[PDB]
Design goal:
The structure is a homodimer. By secondary structure, chain A is α/β, with parallel strands linked by helices. Chain A has a single domain (about 1-414), classed as Isopropylmalate Dehydrogenase, CATH 3.40.718.10. Chain A has helices at about 35-55, 85-90, 110-120, 170-180, 200-215, 235-250, 280-285, 285-290, 300-315, 350-365, 370-385, 390, 405-410, and strands at about 10, 25-30, 60-65, 95-100, 125-130, 145-150, 160-165, 190-200, 220-225, 255, 260-265, 275-280, 295-300, 325, 330-335. In chain A, strands 1, 2, 3, 4, 5, 6, 9, 10, 11, 12, 13, 14 and 15 form a 13-stranded mixed beta sheet that branches. In chain A, strands 7-8 form a two-stranded antiparallel sheet. The first copy, chain A, is globular. Bound molecules: 2-oxoglutaric acid (2 copies) and calcium ion (2 copies). Chains A, B: This is Isocitrate dehydrogenase [NADP]. Chains A, B: Homodimer.
Chain lengths: ~425, ~425
């Protein structure tokens, strides 16, 4: 009951990998909560404009509204934040997009962004961070960071196979380790809370598979495997050995005369590509000190989240940086940012996060000609300085302009 | 057999907290591996100079050499990287210092820095990061970062209560969760590797206890509790609730009219102090975007390591930033940096990391008058530009100068 399908719209099908993405495709789209009400209105007017413009009224998107979040309480009711039909309409109309997400507190639902990333089984989180030539940069020489993250979504500590301290079920796990597994190294077992971090083989490999199938398909230059896999030496140490086993076996990598670093037989394009590991923390400070020595990064969920949220704001990118989640069973384009209500349904926020996720969407759909026309509207607005609140709260010279006027103005540069 | 005691030196005792730190104290000191051979020679000449100078030949340090590392193979032999007597001479001569550490690979020893942090039970890692007015900064406005980290060392995922994929003992743990604990959410259980992350009560509380006993004893301003405790909501969510329970109960904190933020009855000094939590990743980008809204940070081992290694290089601090580890049973001052051998026993490296750890040492010892005389020698060298390799490989104008000439020159500004 509810979720209307758009008539003339044609559902996207599959074929032998060939997304058979129709002239009129139905693209489902969750609005979000909070600042969603603002940001997504723009994202519609705008994706309507680069298809009315590139394909000259030929290709035209047919948008289905669908839901996770606070908006399925006063659309459903009690504890029903995580519905049935949104989860399958992504998997049926194959490309969907979404804004931000209020999980509650109390009614126990667990982080609704990671929740959809694994109930659909979307392995890859795709977080490209780059710079627009003059914005809000903390850093002096900001222009160096041209990188893209592949962060594994199925596992790691963000998998939260976790139990609360002083609870029933940790009594049962902790004694297993002490009495049946011979473990010391828990220090204060009393009132202790325990969490599980997993890492497996085609799990770290279908993650490194697609990262390297992307360094080749997009003519990118390093694949850095980021891991703290020297203290968690199975999991993060393991990830880095199997990620290089994916590169060992299925991709034919050669040794750079001595050990650790490695090289690829790269097919459709021919250019040589480097495969490395940095430790996670040495890498946090790498991206600042010698950036541009770093390019396609592949890692688990935690470091994945933390390298993006660091790399993002280092490019002064915080208001605008994009996001995508990819399965074989379908896909989801997203805002990296949250619900922000203190500055909320009032139009203050940058809508640019999720407009770059529309761009990425269309990419994927092979509508390269459209998406690119979006990179071309963003380029111009930040250069002519006509910007929202978040860019002069760190910037010089804009005609005071807020949210569905930045939507308008992306199109001004198209 | 071996480890010589210095005669006239008097072993440091305890009393009711009163470190009875003698006029002639024996301070044990591990040299390290690699770049250790260089960095620590300086640290001796230098701590000899601010006691010959502040206390005017009255107080004079009596140095004991002791060992963990590669240097107890060709001092002991096989697999004997982690010896018996170093672990107890820290706990007996109460203040010791150390350089960097080569763990091997193969002979299974596990990270010898975390290994000593928990075999002695040293709860607090103390990582102050600040700036010297002009150095190597990636960031434009670098001068804002005046913060200090308290990172819990007993627990978290860096505790590595971990087992390897395809091994005997993970067959036994994974079936426990599936069959006896009712767990799904492991995604590819076959060839999976599993790790344990713990967090308990007086473990997150003796960690927040000392951080707040330090915001008051040093007249510092925020205590930010950093946690990703929204996806690991026991452990990191738990840490933040019990860290605020330490602040709830034993320190008398009041609510800032509404929920989440909090305030303290602060004794010997009277000034009001704020207690907050940020999520880990929003916090990674905080320290760049609105730094100086952040001050005493308390967190577990992982985020603890990663916030320091980020914050450190953002101040262009990478070659020089200090470190300390504190128990009740004694203490250890340290280099944050590793063995670096490609530029190694040849004198290239900054010795300034571990010279600031000597300063911190002396602090603790109540030899405030000495330690401060060290901050006063560092101030001058970086301002008169006479620096090592690592500062012009990011800097303008130094008389080319390398390592035991920077030792000399700290003293030049005293
Ligand atoms: O939305 C969340 O739950 C975490 C926010 C975040 O920073 C991210 O997902 O990268
Ligand atoms: O030395 C290690 O094992 C980790 C290095 C590091 O960055 C740290 O301890 O903060
Ligand atoms: Ca994030
Ligand atoms: Ca570090």
């Amino acid at each position: 009951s509810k979720v209307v399908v758009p008539a003339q719209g044609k559902k996207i099908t599959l074929q032998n990998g060939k997304l058979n993405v129709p002239e009129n495709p139905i693209i489902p789209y969750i609005e979000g909560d909070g600042i969603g009400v603002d940001v997504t209105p723009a994202m519609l007017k705008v994706v309507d404009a680069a298809v009315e413009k590139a394909y000259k009224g030929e290709r035209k998107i047919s948008w289905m509204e669908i839901y996770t979040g606070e908006k399925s309480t006063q659309v459903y009711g009690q504890d029903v934040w995580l519905p049935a039909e949104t989860l399958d309409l992504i998997r049926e109309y194959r490309v969907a997009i979404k804004g931000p997400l209020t999980t509650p507190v109390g009614g126990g639902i667990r982080s609704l962004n990671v929740a959809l990333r694994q109930e659909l089984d979307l392995y890859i989180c795709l977080r490209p961070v780059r710079y627009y030539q003059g914005t809000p940069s903390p850093v002096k020489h900001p222009e160096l960071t041209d990188m893209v993250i592949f962060r594994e979504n199925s596992e790691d500590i963000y998998a939260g196979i976790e139990w609360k301290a002083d609870s029933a079920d940790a009594e049962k796990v902790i004694k297993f380790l002490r009495e049946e597994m011979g473990v010391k190294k828990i220090r204060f077992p009393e009132h202790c809370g325990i969490g599980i971090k997993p890492c497996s083989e085609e799990g770290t490999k279908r993650l490194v598979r697609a990262a390297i199938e992307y360094a080749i398909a997009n003519d990118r230059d390093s694949v850095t495997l980021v891991h703290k896999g020297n203290i968690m030496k199975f999991t993060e140490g393991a990830f880095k050995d199997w990620g290089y086993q994916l590169a060992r076996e299925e991709f034919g990598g050669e040794l750079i005369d001595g050990g650790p670093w490695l090289k690829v037989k790269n097919p459709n394009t021919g250019k040589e590509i480097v495969i490395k590991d940095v430790i996670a923390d040495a890498f946090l400070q790498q991206i600042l000190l010698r950036p541009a020595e770093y390019d396609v990064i592949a890692c688990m969920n935690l470091n994945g989240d933390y390298i993006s949220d660091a790399l993002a704001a280092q490019v002064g990118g915080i208001g605008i940086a994009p996001g995508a989640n990819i399965g074989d069973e379908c896909a989801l384009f997203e805002a990296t940012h949250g619900t922000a209500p203190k500055y909320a349904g009032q139009d203050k926020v940058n809508p640019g996060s999720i407009i770059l996720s529309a761009e990425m969407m269309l990419r994927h759909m092979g509508w390269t000609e459209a998406a690119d026309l979006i990179v071309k509207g963003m380029e111009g607005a930040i250069n002519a300085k006509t910007v929202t609140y978040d860019f002069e709260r760190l910037m010089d010279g804009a005609k005071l302009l807020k949210c569905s006027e930045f939507g308008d103005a992306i199109i001004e540069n198209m």
